[PDB]
Amino acid sequence: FLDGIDKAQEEHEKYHSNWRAMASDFNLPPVVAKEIVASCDKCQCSPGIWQLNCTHLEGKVILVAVHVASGYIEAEVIPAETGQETAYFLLKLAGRWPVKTVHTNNGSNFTSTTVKAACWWAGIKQEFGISQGVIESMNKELKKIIGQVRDQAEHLKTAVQMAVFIHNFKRKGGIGGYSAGERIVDIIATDIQTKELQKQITKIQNFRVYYRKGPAKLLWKGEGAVVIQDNSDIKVVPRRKAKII
Amino acid sequence: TAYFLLKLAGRWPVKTVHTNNGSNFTSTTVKAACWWAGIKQEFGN
Amino acid sequence: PIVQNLQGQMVHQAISPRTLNAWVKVVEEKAFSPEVIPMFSALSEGATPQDLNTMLNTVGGHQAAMQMLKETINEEAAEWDRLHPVHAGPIAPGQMREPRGSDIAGTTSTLQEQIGWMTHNPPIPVGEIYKRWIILGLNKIVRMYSPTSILDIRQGPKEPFRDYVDRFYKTLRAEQASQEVKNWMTETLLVQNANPDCKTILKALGPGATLEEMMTACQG
Amino acid sequence: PIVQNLQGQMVHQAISPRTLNAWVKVVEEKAFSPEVIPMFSALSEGATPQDLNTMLNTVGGHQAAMQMLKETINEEAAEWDRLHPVHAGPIAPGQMREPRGSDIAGTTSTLQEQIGWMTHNPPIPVGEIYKRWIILGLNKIVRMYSPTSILDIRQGPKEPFRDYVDRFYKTLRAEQASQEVKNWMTETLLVQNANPDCKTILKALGPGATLEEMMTACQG
Amino acid sequence: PIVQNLQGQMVHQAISPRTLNAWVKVVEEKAFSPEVIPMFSALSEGATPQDLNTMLNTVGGHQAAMQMLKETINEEAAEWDRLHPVHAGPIAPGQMREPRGSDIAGTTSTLQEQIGWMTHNPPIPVGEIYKRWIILGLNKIVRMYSPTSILDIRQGPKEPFRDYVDRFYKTLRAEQASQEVKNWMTETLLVQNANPDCKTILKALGPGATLEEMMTACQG
Amino acid sequence: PIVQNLQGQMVHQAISPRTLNAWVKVVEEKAFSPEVIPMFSALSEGATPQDLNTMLNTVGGHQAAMQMLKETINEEAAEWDRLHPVHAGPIAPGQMREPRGSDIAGTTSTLQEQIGWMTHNPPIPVGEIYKRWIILGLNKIVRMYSPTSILDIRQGPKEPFRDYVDRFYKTLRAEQASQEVKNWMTETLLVQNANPDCKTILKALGPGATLEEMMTACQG
Amino acid sequence: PIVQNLQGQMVHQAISPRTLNAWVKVVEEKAFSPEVIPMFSALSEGATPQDLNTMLNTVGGHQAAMQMLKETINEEAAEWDRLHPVHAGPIAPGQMREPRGSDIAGTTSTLQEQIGWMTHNPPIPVGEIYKRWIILGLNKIVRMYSPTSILDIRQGPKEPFRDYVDRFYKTLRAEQASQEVKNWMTETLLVQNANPDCKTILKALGPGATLEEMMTACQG
Numbered sequence A: 001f002l003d004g005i006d007k008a009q010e011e012h013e014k015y016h017s018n019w020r021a022m023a024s025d026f027n028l029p030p031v032v033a034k035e036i037v038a039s040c041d042k043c044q045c046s047p048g049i050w051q052l053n054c055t056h057l058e059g060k061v062i063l064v065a066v067h068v069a070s071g072y073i074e075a076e077v078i079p080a081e082t083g084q085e086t087a088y089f090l091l092k093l094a095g096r097w098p099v100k101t102v103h104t105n106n107g108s109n110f111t112s113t114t115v116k117a118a119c120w121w122a123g124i125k126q127e128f129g130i131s132q133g134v135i136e137s138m139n140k141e142l143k144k145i146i147g148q149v150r151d152q153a154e155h156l157k158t159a160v161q162m163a164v165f166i167h168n169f170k171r172k173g174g175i176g177g178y179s180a181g182e183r184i185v186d187i188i189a190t191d192i193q194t195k196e197l198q199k200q201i202t203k204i205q206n207f208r209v210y211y212r213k214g215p216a217k218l219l220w221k222g223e224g225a226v227v228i229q230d231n232s233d234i235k236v237v238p239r240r241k242a243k244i245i
Numbered sequence B: 001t002a003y004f005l006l007k008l009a010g011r012w013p014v015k016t017v018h019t020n021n022g023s024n025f026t027s028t029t030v031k032a033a034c035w036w037a038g039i040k041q042e043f044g045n
Numbered sequence C, D, E, F, G: 001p002i003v004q005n006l007q008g009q010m011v012h013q014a015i016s017p018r019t020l021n022a023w024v025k026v027v028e029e030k031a032f033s034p035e036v037i038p039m040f041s042a043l044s045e046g047a048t049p050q051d052l053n054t055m056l057n058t059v060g061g062h063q064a065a066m067q068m069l070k071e072t073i074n075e076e077a078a079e080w081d082r083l084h085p086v087h088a089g090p091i092a093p094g095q096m097r098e099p100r101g102s103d104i105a106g107t108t109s110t111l112q113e114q115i116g117w118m119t120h121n122p123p124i125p126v127g128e129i130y131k132r133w134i135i136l137g138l139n140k141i142v143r144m145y146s147p148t149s150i151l152d153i154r155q156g157p158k159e160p161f162r163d164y165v166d167r168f169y170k171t172l173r174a175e176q177a178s179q180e181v182k183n184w185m186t187e188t189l190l191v192q193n194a195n196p197d198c199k200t201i202l203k204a205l206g207p208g209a210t211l212e213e214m215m216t217a218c219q220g
């Protein structure tokens, strides 16, 4: 806040970011951030769930992939519509992020030989036909930020990359006011630590609980409740009628 | 090179970078690209 | 290649390795873009049909177009054989009869016959006829490799029209229409298929407006 | 092109692949900056109009510039036809009549006509006239391709005057005007729109001094 | 360029594209370091002033130094004209008048006049003089690109003396001054700007000693 | 540089740009190592001192070595002037006195003086003397740029003899001394500084054994 | 090197930088495989001993091989001195001193007397003798760089016979042997060391069959 108004103005003249981003990053009250936004003439699921789609912009085809559970985006303008570039983008996004499922349509390029080879090589599950409202809203938001930044852009690729860079970091999301990158980092880190801790205790703790049936294994005991799993089915019972051995 | 640097910035947050003195690394385009993203450019660990 | 000696006589020479290396690398780098069509005539000046065949055989891959051009060469050789009456009888010393289809194709005529025909008076531009046949084959190959037509191209609502007109002319050069039709389309299509503001400015300018004034009027 | 032998005559030669490759790569890489204007004259000395036409045709992309060059060549050919009307009467043996506009453009004239005209006594500078027409076309195309004018160059507050005057001279050289007008620009506009501190320093220095004092004055 | 026939007379030839490409590449790629002074003098062993101008104006970017050298060339031409005015009166047949300032600058004189001057008896190395003029400007150009002075060089606490003395000699060579003052400063400023340990070691060796003993003591 | 002419008197020749490009490339890519000594003599055969200075100034960076070699050149020139009788006074046409200490360095002598000296009868190999002075400077600066010694190379228990003898010979060539001491060290140190197994093998082989049987016995 | 002038006589020339650069880079980067032996004989044709030793010592790396070949050159010089009687006596015009072992190595002789030997009648092929000595040394050093014997090549159970026979032939060529023993080995060893299935297949095929039958039968 100490002389941060000047920095906020000099960075909003270049980014045109939302008021909450300036408030959180630069430690400014929301009122002055909203005033800065107004004063600008240009402003008024599992982690593997990824959706890829094709859009048309100024006579150019663009393939854009979105992380459904975190809002992360990645777009690239394909020069000539062919499945080879679709497969190249798929393998690049696989090499940059772990993906377990693909949500695309039944297009010819989506079912290309190279795309199928790449998806089989990566072991990614394929699901044709599809939540889409979030994809459409992100598409319109990227279109409007592209329109905003096109005045200072020379080519389409640079403008698209600038829009992606602004959207993924300089835009606070929903719950908690966290950007797409923060959300995806948080969710993948939490998944990693939870799976580590879950795999850590399986070797040590092994108890057998009888209820009402069979030798089920203890999963969680406390708060007057026993949750267990038997025959790949999870059952929750009260503390009564449950013997722990 | 500036396009690749912009892609890297769009994927991960970068604050500073150390690089050698190659001809393409000292060009005006990469200088403008790092001026945009506010990358602390250092030549020369 | 056949290069005239300095204050001497035209003597046949071997093809330089670097020229054919450049030809094959530019063929493999580009997917038979129209710009390679003039470049061919920039590399095969005064070359015997045997040299043309040797240069043609250097291509790696893209054999469908090579088969198509070979078929068109064969049919053109048949047409040349059928249109020109075949002289029969003794061969005059120092000269030779009209080349056959396989002779103009260069697959049977020896180098000595090619040299004799080149030095024959009146001149025999058999190599030039073969080069023109190859040019026609390359034109139809470019038509084969055209990814889209010209009448279906559209201009983006917010696209700067510089790239629009650039790609419009790039696609236009690939067209195999008559010159008058080309003039008509380059006068009507681009002015009738623009953005509303630029099209309004152009129709205000009226007909007979050169493309320089066309683009300077729509500058933004 | 056509090269002169050691104390000999002017003999034709095929186009060197290195020259055309360098030309096309420098055109692609350097876009349409003015510094390519001299390079063209470095790669076209003693060359036939056919060679210039081939070199213009080899470059791919930017087809609007090529179309504008073609139309300017056509109108210059019309001007040549208009200033030198169609001659009549038999031509003496060993001589060829004055080339038409199409012959100068090279669209209807074979290389043999160029060879005859170049070696004719007195020499016919058809190639030089075509080169000058291409130079005028390139001048107008680089005037067209200039991103902005010269009267709107604004110096940033934190921007040092080094790159400011560099781009000011870039736009000045990109502008086509008279030598006296350019001198007036370099005398007034360089200081009339500078940063206020440098403006005051230059006013303290006094008009009528070399720009070396200007660059050594406002350092920092 | 200007060459001599084998046991014959002097002739003029076109400029090799390779040399111009290498010159422009080496100028643009690295920097405006002092090694441009030898490199340029290694690519102009005999050429007309028009050739020098063509080699000069092809540079892309950094037009500020180009304007500096153009202004220095103009003032040198003016001073040459005022100190040695071209004598008036009749001109003897078979010769031509003395080149003017515009002639040595190459702005107005044609290539034929330059060739005639080079082959004249006695020969006029006017273009060569022009080259030396450019050299003078180039010196000032290096003064443009010196980032520091001859005194603000200091050795870091973790910086070995190798790159320290390398930078010191680089800045000394970038300095345009007398040789005697350079010798005076290289015998004194080296020890003053050195880390205390090796500084005191080399002082114990003896002041004014050559760098051989200094570097043998400063090892590690 | 200096080119021998076909049954004719020698004439001055410029330096090919590729020669300088290769020289600067090999200087930059590899640090100061003995292998640059032959390469130098492979690019400066019969070259004039001016050409030697021009190619020496082309280097970039490492100016400390350049200053050291300039100092050694100056001291060698002073010694040469002291040992040979100084010359002065007028000389008959077609002849001139021997080059001074500054003339052999090329800092005051012009190209014409060097040409006259090399074409003199009998010729004066001043260029060869300057080249051998440069060779001595290169030897001493390669000795300067050798970090490791000859008496410190050790063979590891698992280290093969191949790279051991390789580095031994690297250091042997990097060290400048008499031939006899080089033979003594290359006969004694290699066996005296090896693993015990190969040491006993070589002792069994006996003194004075050839290197081939030595290394085919130590191998394994 | 010494080259044949067009319709002229033998003329000495320096080594082009391209040839030596290509030689050193291919030697350092590709291998010490025997296929480099023809390459050398394709580069040193019509050379001089000075050029031979300059090319020999320029290449860096693997200096143990350089010392080995120097030792073999010294021993071959001793052999030449001892087998060929040394004729000591007066030297008359039309004759020069007898070639020596050190003269063949180009150590005690300079370039001009080597040229005189080349032009001397009767011709003295000292360069050819040095080249064949280098060939013998290179054969010894390529024998040194064969890590495996010829009797230890065994086909792996899962190893395809293609690369197996390829490396078998490579090691056979690298092996120093006569023609008849090579024929015996290529007739016996390959079938005596194959996989059992192809072993029985080729035994069923029987003798008197070329490698085509063996390779068509061992597939699968």
Ligand SMILES: O=P(O)(O)O[C@H]1[C@H](OP(=O)(O)O)[C@@H](OP(=O)(O)O)[C@H](OP(=O)(O)O)[C@@H](OP(=O)(O)O)[C@H]1OP(=O)(O)O
Residues within 6 Å of the ligand: C018, D018, E018, F018, F021
């Ligand atoms: O055009 P490329 O296929 O890449 O080959 C070039 C070309 O060599 P050629 O003229 O023999 O084909 C260069 O010559 P120019 O482009 O200047 O006409 C040459 O340059 P130098 O001869 O001056 O070395 C260069 O070599 P380099 O890459 O070392 O600069 C070499 O490339 P390659 O060496 O890779 O074949």
Ligand SMILES: O=P(O)(O)O[C@H]1[C@H](OP(=O)(O)O)[C@@H](OP(=O)(O)O)[C@H](OP(=O)(O)O)[C@@H](OP(=O)(O)O)[C@H]1OP(=O)(O)O
Residues within 6 Å of the ligand: E016, E018, F016, F018, G016, G018
């Ligand atoms: O040796 P050649 O087969 O006759 O080819 C040469 C050679 O070029 P390459 O080494 O690239 O093949 C010359 O280079 P130098 O050997 O003289 O260094 C080159 O001269 P430039 O590279 O300086 O242009 C010359 O070209 P030109 O005849 O134009 O002087 C060119 O001859 P070609 O043009 O016939 O290939």
Ligand SMILES: [Zn+2]
Residues within 6 Å of the ligand: A012, A015, A016, A017, A037, A040, A041, A042, A043
């Ligand atoms: Zn805004």
